[PDB]
Structure 1
Amino acid sequence: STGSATTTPIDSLDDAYITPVQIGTPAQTLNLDFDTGSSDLWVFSSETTASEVDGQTIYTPSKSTTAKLLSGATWSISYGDGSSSSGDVYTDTVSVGGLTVTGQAVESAKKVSSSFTEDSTIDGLLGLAFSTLNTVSPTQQKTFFDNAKASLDSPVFTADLGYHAPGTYNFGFIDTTAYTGSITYTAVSTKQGFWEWTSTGYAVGSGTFKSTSIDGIADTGTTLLYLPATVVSAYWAQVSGAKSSSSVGGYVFPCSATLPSFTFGVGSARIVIPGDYIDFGPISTGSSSCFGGIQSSAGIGINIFGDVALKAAFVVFNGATTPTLGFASK
């Protein structure tokens, strides 16, 4: 089997991407944030605290003939931006882009933190990291990809995120029309439950490439590119007026700037992030100070190849017995 679904930016900055997911019988379609950095599929629901729902589409398990309470199971998760959610668990039929999993754990939110409430366009998350990170207790549950894997034509999914435009998540096949040149594959460590890999270095603009190992995670659920302070300083030093602002919470730059590109290494291959992808616009409405898309990972504890990096590439998440990651230009 295979699946293919379009993923759409939630706003003009590509702050996140949503992908329609069919849950239950008859189908209830919710727009979920596919997140290769976590492993829980959770949704706004009929059980969510009413004051914490503001415009989201909810899953109502009582209206699904295939929903079953997973007795005794609870979940609770916290994300890297400080947001969180928790609740109980159903199993139900879940389909993405024509690919169907029966008995998928659908984690129903009883509580969500303020930033989720405020994100009216995100109806939940669909985790695509390794199932060892799934938070369901006392019986850990498998991700959608883990459940679908055996049935897929090939045990892979791909992320093809658009810049200020829709893109595609495919399951079970590699669309050889969706990228240019060849796919370069690179080793993955699953020791921390992430799609963790090591970039071979970087360049700023038209500058020379610096060969240096940068361990980090391919994370579709994180907006920006978070890299070591040395790398980030070298980038922003090429933008007149750019500075790190403690009050804003990262590097800002004059909105009048033309940003240089940023290149990262994948083995001997190179992915180029155009400067425009690094612009996240005014820090507040009407400001001439703009927020940067490359930020320091210092104090996160891990480097994160988020959407800013991933949207510059066609990315293969290869879930073979020994997982790997592939990157191609597009």
Structure 2
Amino acid sequence: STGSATTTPIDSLDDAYITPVQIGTPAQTLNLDFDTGSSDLWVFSSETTASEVDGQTIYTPSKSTTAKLLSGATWSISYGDGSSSSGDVYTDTVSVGGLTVTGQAVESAKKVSSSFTEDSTIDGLLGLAFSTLNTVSPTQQKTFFDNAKASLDSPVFTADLGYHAPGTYNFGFIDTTAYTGSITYTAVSTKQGFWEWTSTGYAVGSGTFKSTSIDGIADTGTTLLYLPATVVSAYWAQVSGAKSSSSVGGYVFPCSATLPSFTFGVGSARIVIPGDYIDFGPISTGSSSCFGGIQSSAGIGINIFGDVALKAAFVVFNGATTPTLGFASK
């Protein structure tokens, strides 16, 4: 089997992407944030505290003929941005882009933190990291990918995120029309439950490439590119008037600037992030200070190749017995 679904930016900045997901019988379609940095499929639901729901579409298990309470199971998750959610668990039929899994754990939120409530466009998350990170207790549950894997034509999914445009998540096949040149594959460590890999270095603009190992994670659920402070300082030093602002919480730059590109290495290959991808617009409405898309990972404890980086590539998440990542230009 295969599946193919379009993923759509939630706003004009590409702060996140949503993908429609069918849950239950008859189908209830929710728009989920596919997150290769976590391993829980959780939804706004009929159980969510009413004051914490503001415009989201909810899953109502009582209206699904295939929903079953997973008795005694609970979940609770905290993300890198400080957000959180928790609740109880159903199993139900879940389809993505025509690919169906029966018996998928659908984590129903009883509580969500304010950032979730305030984002009306995201109805929940679909985690695509390794199932070792799944938070269900006392019986850990599998991701949608892990449950689909054995049925897929190939044990892979791909992320093809757009810049200010829709893109695609495919399951079970590699669309050879969706990228240019060849795909470079690189090793993955699953020791922390992430798609963790090592970039071979970077360049700023037209500058020379710096060969240096940068360990980090491929994380579709993180907006920005978080890299070591040395690398980030070297990038922003090329932008007149850029500075790190402790009050704003990262590097800002004059909205009048033209940003340089940023290149990262994948083995001997290179992915170029155009400068425009690094502009996250005014820090507050009408400001002439703009927020940067490359930020320091210092204090986060891991480097994160978030959407800023991944949207410059066609990315293969290879879930074979030994997982690997692949990157191609597009």
TM-score by length of 1: 1.00
- Aligned equivalents of 2:226, 2:72: Cα separation in 1: 38
RMSD: 0.1
CA-CA distance at 1:133 after TM superposition:
0.1
What is the DSSP-based 3-state SS (H/G/I as helix, E as strand, rest coil) of the residue aligned with 1:312?
coil
- Aligned equivalents of 2:114, 2:195: Cα separation in 1: 28
Runs of at least 5 residues in structure 2 that lack an aligned partner in the other structure: none
Q: Percent of pairs identical after alignment?
A: 100
- Aligned equivalents of 1:197, 1:231: Cα separation in 2: 17
- Aligned equivalents of 2:289, 2:262: Cα separation in 1: 20
CA-CA distance at 1:319 after TM superposition:
0.1
| Number of positions where the alignment pairs a residue of Structure 1 with one of Structure 2 | 330
- Aligned equivalents of 2:113, 2:96: Cα separation in 1: 26
CA-CA distance at 1:139 after TM superposition:
0.1
> CA deviation digits over 1:113-154, x for unaligned, max 9?
000000000000000000000000000000000000000000
What is the DSSP-based 3-state SS (H/G/I as helix, E as strand, rest coil) of the residue aligned with 2:148?
helix
- Aligned equivalents of 1:31, 1:79: Cα separation in 2: 19
Q: Which residue is 1:171 aligned to?
A: 171
CA-CA distance at 1:85 after TM superposition:
0.1
CA-CA distance at 1:209 after TM superposition:
0.0
> CA deviation digits over 1:281-320, x for unaligned, max 9?
0000000000000000000000000000000000000000
Residues 231-242 of structure 1 mapped to structure 2, 5 A cutoff: 231-242=231-242
Residues 92-241 of structure 1 mapped to structure 2, 5 A cutoff: 92-241=92-241
- Aligned equivalents of 1:180, 1:15: Cα separation in 2: 26
* Residue 284, structure 1, aligned to residue 288, structure 2: no
- Aligned equivalents of 2:119, 2:271: Cα separation in 1: 31
> CA deviation digits over 1:68-98, x for unaligned, max 9?
0000000000000000000000000000000
What is the DSSP-based 3-state SS (H/G/I as helix, E as strand, rest coil) of the residue aligned with 1:121?
coil
Segments of 4+ moved more than 6 angstroms: none
CA-CA distance at 1:59 after TM superposition:
0.1
CA-CA distance at 1:324 after TM superposition:
0.0
Q: Which residue is 1:26 aligned to?
A: 26
CA-CA distance at 1:217 after TM superposition:
0.1
What is the DSSP-based 3-state SS (H/G/I as helix, E as strand, rest coil) of the residue aligned with 1:276?
helix
CA-CA distance at 1:43 after TM superposition:
0.0
> CA deviation digits over 1:169-223, x for unaligned, max 9?
0000000000000000000000000000000000000000000000000000000
TM-score by length of 2: 1.00
Runs of at least 5 residues in structure 1 that lack an aligned partner in the other structure: none
- Aligned equivalents of 1:135, 1:115: Cα separation in 2: 20
- Aligned equivalents of 1:237, 1:61: Cα separation in 2: 53
- Aligned equivalents of 1:247, 1:69: Cα separation in 2: 46
